[PDB]
Amino acid sequence: DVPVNLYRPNAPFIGKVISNEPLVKEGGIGIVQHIKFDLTGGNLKYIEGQSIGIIPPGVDKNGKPEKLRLYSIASTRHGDDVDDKTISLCVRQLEYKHPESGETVYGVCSTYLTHIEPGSEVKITGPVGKEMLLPDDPEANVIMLATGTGIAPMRTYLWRMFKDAERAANPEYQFKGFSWLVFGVPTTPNILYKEELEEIQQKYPDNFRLTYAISREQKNPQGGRMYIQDRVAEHADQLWQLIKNQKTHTYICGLRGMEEGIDAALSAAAAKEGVTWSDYQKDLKKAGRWHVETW
Numbered sequence: 458d459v460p461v462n463l464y465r466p467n468a469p470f471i472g473k474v475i476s477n478e479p480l481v482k483e484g485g486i487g488i489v490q491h492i493k494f495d496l497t498g499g500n501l502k503y504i505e506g507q508s509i510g511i512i513p514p515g516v517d518k519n520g521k522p523e524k525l526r527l528y529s530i531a532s533t534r535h536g537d538d539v540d541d542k543t544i545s546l547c548v549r550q551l552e553y554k555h556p557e558s559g560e561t562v563y564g565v566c567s568t569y570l571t572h573i574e575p576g577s578e579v580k581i582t583g584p585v586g587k588e589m590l591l592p593d594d595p596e597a598n599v600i601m602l603a604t605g606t607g608i609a610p611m612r613t614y615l616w617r618m619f620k621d622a623e624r625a626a627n628p629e630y631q632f633k634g635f636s637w638l639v640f641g642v643p644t645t646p647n648i649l650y651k652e653e654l655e656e657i658q659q660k661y662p663d664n665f666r667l668t669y670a671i672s673r674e675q676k677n678p679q680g681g682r683m684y685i686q687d688r689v690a691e692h693a694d695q696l697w698q699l700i701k702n703q704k705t706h707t708y709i710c711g712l713r714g715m716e717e718g719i720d721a722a723l724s725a726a727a728a729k730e731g732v733t734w735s736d737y738q739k740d741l742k743k744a745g746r747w748h749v750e751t752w
């Protein structure tokens with residue numbers, strides 16, 4: 458019964474930004490912001506795993522209106538306020554060099570948001586998606602593989618799982634299963650939510666496992682940069698075993714560049730046990746326990 462598109466892209470909800478706290482601490486790379494909007498009075502309800510769209514002002518080169526962009530929701534259904542009045546996004550300002558002219562180029566909607574001023578009205582659409590929904594089963598297991606801003610939904614799971622206030626507010630959902638987040642980022646200053654993430658590993662040690670793949674501070678066995686799939690291979694067998702359990706849901710959010718690695722590792726660990734991942738997986742997917750959201 459997931460609520461979808463309570464706001465079409467042609468009648469966006471206009472909400473005021475509440476805060477735009479920065480997530481990349483000194484020294485890290487780029488900019489990644491934690492923007493919280495205020496939905497009060499709009500009836501825009503959503504559930505962990507979904508994502509909303511933001512429509513920047515302006516028009517493109519071709520003179521047409523700037524089409525919306527998606528963004529995984531980073532807050533739970535209650536918002537960081539635990540009052541059902543807000544919603545928050547985890548947004549990295551896009552910034553690259555022109556394939557030919559060297560000129561630095563920033564992204565449109567991403568710079569718009571990363572620099573959005575608290576108190577500014579922002580066009581919001583959605584929520585959409587039913588592929589990253591967290592199972593209601595408190596006894597389920599959650600393996601989470603994400604990179605960069607891909608942590609956004611993982612935050613919405615983890616929070617709804619271990620953040621006290623949430624526990625208090627969600628009597629029906631008192632997590633007891635096992636969760637494991639393999640988080641891929643460039644540097645330590647870039648470990649988005651490092652504070653809370655590592656905090657939850659305190660409160661609930663036997664229920665949350667945080668593995669980091671800090672790409673530019675860690676080298677993998679082959680000499681290369683430590684990426685998610687490397688970690689996923691380091692604890693391959695374990696993961697595989699934890700994946701065979703029928704109460705285990707896996708969630709992947711980030712660059713499809715990982716899918717290849719993750720499949721490679723898991724498929725191998727699945728061979729030692731005479732099993733064909735490519736097919737077993739096809740099932741997890743059909744079963745609805747292989748949630749993948751890449752961009």
Ligand SMILES: Cc1cc2nc3c(=O)[nH]c(=O)nc-3n(C[C@H](O)[C@H](O)[C@H](O)COP(=O)(O)OP(=O)(O)OC[C@H]3O[C@@H](n4cnc5c(N)ncnc54)[C@H](O)[C@@H]3O)c2cc1C
Nearest residue numbers: 526527528529547548549551553564565566567606609752
């Ligand atoms: C389901 C989904 C979830 C998402 N979740 C998040 C999230 O939580 N956080 C987040 O930031 N984004 C997320 N995004 C991405 C979001 O849609 C936008 O792509 C992003 O925020 C950039 O917006 P922009 O307007 O700055 O992009 P634009 O400025 O419009 O840039 C996009 C264009 O830039 C060009 N381009 C990009 N890089 C280069 C380069 N290296 N060299 C040459 N050309 C280049 C390409 O032509 C591309 O079409 C998500 C996307 C989807 C599909």
Ligand SMILES: NC(=O)c1ccc[n+]([C@@H]2O[C@H](COP(=O)([O-])OP(=O)(O)OC[C@H]3O[C@@H](n4cnc5c(N)ncnc54)[C@H](OP(=O)(O)O)[C@@H]3O)[C@@H](O)[C@H]2O)c1
Nearest residue numbers: 549551604605606607641642643672684711712714715752
């Ligand atoms: N995070 C994402 O899932 C994602 C999604 C789409 C686009 N991007 C691009 O990167 C920016 C990401 O910013 P962000 O905060 O989302 O993420 P981020 O902070 O850049 O984190 C991305 C992480 O992904 C790692 N990575 C790079 N190539 C990979 C690959 N081949 N396979 C697996 N992991 C890989 C990176 O390693 P190195 O950087 O050290 O190579 C880095 O540690 C975007 O603006 C866009 O340019 C990222």
